[PDB]
Amino acid sequence: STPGAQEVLFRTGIAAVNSTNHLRVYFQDSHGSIRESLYESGWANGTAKNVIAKAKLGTPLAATSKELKNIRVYSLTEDNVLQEAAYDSGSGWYNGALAGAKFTVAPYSRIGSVFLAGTNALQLRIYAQKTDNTIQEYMWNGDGWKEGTNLGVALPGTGIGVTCWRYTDYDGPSIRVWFQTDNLKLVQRAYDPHTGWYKELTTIFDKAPPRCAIAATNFNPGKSSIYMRIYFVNSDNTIWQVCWDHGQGYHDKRTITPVIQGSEIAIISWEGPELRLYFQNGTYVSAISEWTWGKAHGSQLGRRALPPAE
Amino acid sequence: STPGAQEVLFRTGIAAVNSTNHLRVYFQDSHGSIRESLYESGWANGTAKNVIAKAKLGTPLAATSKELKNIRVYSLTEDNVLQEAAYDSGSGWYNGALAGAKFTVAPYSRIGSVFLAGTNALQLRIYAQKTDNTIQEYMWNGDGWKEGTNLGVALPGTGIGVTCWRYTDYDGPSIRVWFQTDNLKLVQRAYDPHTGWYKELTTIFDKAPPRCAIAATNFNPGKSSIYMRIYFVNSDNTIWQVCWDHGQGYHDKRTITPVIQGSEIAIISWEGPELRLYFQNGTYVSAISEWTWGKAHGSQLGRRALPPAE
Ligand SMILES: C[Se][C@@H]1O[C@@H](C)[C@@H](O)[C@@H](O)[C@@H]1O
Ligand SMILES: C[Se][C@@H]1O[C@@H](C)[C@@H](O)[C@@H](O)[C@@H]1O
Ligand SMILES: C[Se][C@@H]1O[C@@H](C)[C@@H](O)[C@@H](O)[C@@H]1O
Ligand SMILES: C[Se][C@@H]1O[C@@H](C)[C@@H](O)[C@@H](O)[C@@H]1O
Ligand SMILES: C[Se][C@@H]1O[C@@H](C)[C@@H](O)[C@@H](O)[C@@H]1O
Ligand SMILES: C[Se][C@@H]1O[C@@H](C)[C@@H](O)[C@@H](O)[C@@H]1O
Ligand SMILES: C[Se][C@@H]1O[C@@H](C)[C@@H](O)[C@@H](O)[C@@H]1O
Ligand SMILES: C[Se][C@@H]1O[C@@H](C)[C@@H](O)[C@@H](O)[C@@H]1O
Ligand SMILES: C[Se][C@@H]1O[C@@H](C)[C@@H](O)[C@@H](O)[C@@H]1O
Ligand SMILES: C[Se][C@@H]1O[C@@H](C)[C@@H](O)[C@@H](O)[C@@H]1O
Structure with a gap:
């Protein structure tokens, strides 16, 4: 390992945001502080001077953004209690109002977070697991945090994946949420602007490791078309990918890359499509590694050890 | 899962002591408190009313005992800072003097602990990883905690296994310590009463997962003979066993039982030989399971979900 890598908590939560290839990655260090590494034509930071929040050891991490003007990081x-680190362009980092609402969740809860797409207004939906193991939605729509729709019972400590987009034909955001149920299946809950929340759980995988990491993204949204990717750590100790592609539905399941036992994962994407995965695979023991996909070279490992590791 | 099982921290540290088939198992709950479950012709306790200490989330755990008269549990x-929960027959549980010595270790450090065998006096040796990644010995011999021998550089966050016995022919304790080096090998350091600490690192396994759990025991010590068992979580997501048997040396390596990704492990034994392993394998998601070995039936799974899970 390296002195920098040792600062990164083993099996740390991981979250990432971006505006095309301008990237931010969030993680927890060994003393509980949440740090930010960035990519601006090169990787940097991730040091003790780059702390945006402090959270309990082994906290979940979630993050969402509107480009890089507004960023929210949850832990x-x-x-x-759900808390929020907030960045606004022109004001910098500050404590968000979420903790003020005093939303208590299960100790083993994970978090998902999305800005609602299709509007310039700042609307947020975040998802967590309450003490009754149900996945609760919490919302921001301009004046205060409120509980939203409850999405029903999930496995204790389930991973939570969430993505959001807007169909060109429709006037409102579409939302997809992924988690693990008691039968260890991976399933999907769905919200569309013209239907509201569908009742149907859609299975995307029959049997995954208990409390496996889950993370999702979408790209190339159209008039009534979408492409989605969902990632989870399978029992073979690699990240697996589930593909939704317009005109094919859920039509593919395949391994992507090795990871350490019990690694967390983060996924970002931009039009192209370009994909970036972040995870721990044992590089310098505890450093965060990058996996890439692009139209040019396809599936390629990226940055081997994110800052502060190197 | 079950409400009881949910209280058990996922990938919790695990430690166990015994006097023959009278057993105590220690683990951490989701709020950081260290609990004790017991076996006295039946499993019991492990509840919030059975807390013996409080430690940081994801703390290592180590424990050693002289039968069940004296018990020490480290976190x-x-x-x-290394701290010690102490039980003495006739006085019950109390804070041990260890924390008073203010020994600071690496955030990712593990702990090993042994009472020195062969004497009725209460002598302790405990092992941890300092911030320079060296494995430091700390000792108690009657009046105060002191730093002992340093065993050299190990992998950051290495597991630490330790066992202790007394050869009948010799007048002093023998000690064996196992950890993982930078080349991801598993190795042995050794102390004998007539030699002191040997300089030689002995390899017992060529390549294990980074920061894999490690735990060891010994049984049937003789005049100049010993039998040792070392357990670690391998990359296939099972506990593996390494056997030392008198007249054969290190002569066997085999899988034992499945475990969750990144499970910690504890091992106890008594004359027979009887062996008990404790670990998490996904039973009720987060409960601790038992694996057994005896002369009667050989390799058999034991208690599926320890208290408080059931
Ligand atoms: C063409 Se460099 C490629 O794309 C960047 C946006 C980063 O993800 C970098 O780590 C990767 O190696
Ligand atoms: C414009 Se400052 C730069 O960009 C923002 C998106 C944040 O990640 C901030 O922490 C970083 O220092
Ligand atoms: C302008 Se209030 C600021 O932005 C909102 C979108 C929310 O994240 C809120 O919690 C935060 O305090
Ligand atoms: C206008 Se309904 C409101 O916004 C939607 C996008 C969903 O988050 C729904 O659960 C919530 O109740
Ligand atoms: C047409 Se390749 C297909 O779509 C890409 C965007 C990636 O998700 C790749 O892993 C998948 O196999
Ligand atoms: C003959 Se019961 C057997 O031995 C006991 C001492 C315990 O380890 C118990 O869980 C196991 O099932
Ligand atoms: C004689 Se009390 C019983 O036995 C001791 C060995 C301890 O484990 C204590 O916590 C338990 O309540
Ligand atoms: C009679 Se002091 C008691 O017992 C010793 C063996 C040590 O564990 C010490 O730290 C503890 O406070
Ligand atoms: C009488 Se030397 C003392 O006790 C031995 C058993 C070892 O722990 C050694 O490292 C220590 O310095
Ligand atoms: C003569 Se079986 C041999 O020794 C036993 C005591 C156990 O450790 C078992 O796993 C091993 O295979």
């Missing part, structure tokens, strides 16, 4: 306090 | 504070 858990030591009392298992 | 890390949130400042990564």
